[PDB]
Design an enzyme around this catalytic site. Sequence first.
Site, PDB file in Angstrom:
ATOM      1  CD  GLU A  35      51.753  -2.071   9.406  1.00 54.30           C
ATOM      2  OE1 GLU A  35      52.005  -1.237  10.221  1.00 54.30           O
ATOM      3  OE2 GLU A  35      52.646  -2.512   8.581  1.00 54.30           O
ATOM      4  CG  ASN A  46      56.847   6.697  11.726  1.00 55.76           C
ATOM      5  OD1 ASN A  46      56.116   7.160  10.790  1.00 55.76           O
ATOM      6  ND2 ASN A  46      56.584   5.543  12.334  1.00 55.76           N
ATOM      7  CG  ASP A  48      60.486  10.001   9.310  1.00 57.72           C
ATOM      8  OD1 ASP A  48      59.463  10.006   9.964  1.00 57.72           O
ATOM      9  OD2 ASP A  48      60.550   9.522   8.118  1.00 57.72           O
ATOM     10  CB  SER A  50      56.605  10.780   8.683  1.00 58.20           C
ATOM     11  OG  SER A  50      57.201   9.553   9.027  1.00 58.20           O
ATOM     12  CG  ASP A  52      53.320   4.902  10.165  1.00 58.55           C
ATOM     13  OD1 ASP A  52      53.851   5.570   9.323  1.00 58.55           O
ATOM     14  OD2 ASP A  52      53.928   3.989  10.835  1.00 58.55           O
ATOM     15  CG  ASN A  59      55.352   7.449   6.583  1.00 57.99           C
ATOM     16  OD1 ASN A  59      56.007   8.233   5.886  1.00 57.99           O
ATOM     17  ND2 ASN A  59      55.432   7.419   7.920  1.00 57.99           N
TER      18      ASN A  59
END
Length: 129
Positions: A35, A46, A48, A50, A52, A59
């Site tokens: 990750e 991301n 959308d 958002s 991480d 998220n």
Amino acid sequence: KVFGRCELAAAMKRHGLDNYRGYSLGNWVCAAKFESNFNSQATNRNTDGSTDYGILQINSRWWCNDGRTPGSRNLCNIPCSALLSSDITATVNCAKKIVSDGNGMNAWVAWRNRCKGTDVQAWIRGCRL
């Protein structure tokens, strides 16, 4: 902070992640590897809108507040920046809520694609735990 493989394994163990919800320690370490490459400061935006954050790439759409994800829910009750600390406590606490949530570790796309069904024990091999 960029952790060492065994250093992280030990901290997550100490923080009660081993066998948490039935996921052995190597699962957690494998996920952190893919990750964030073990870097607590990792961020990735991301599509959308958002983002991480941290070693486990939690998220901002559901789990933490970053003040720029409209409609964020903040399920872990914390600022996303808290997940970037050298102290993994906030990460661990929040991850325990995520994994209890229904789809288990499948929540983590890299775990699902890179760890699941692999010999995850290789990840804590040689560590003094």
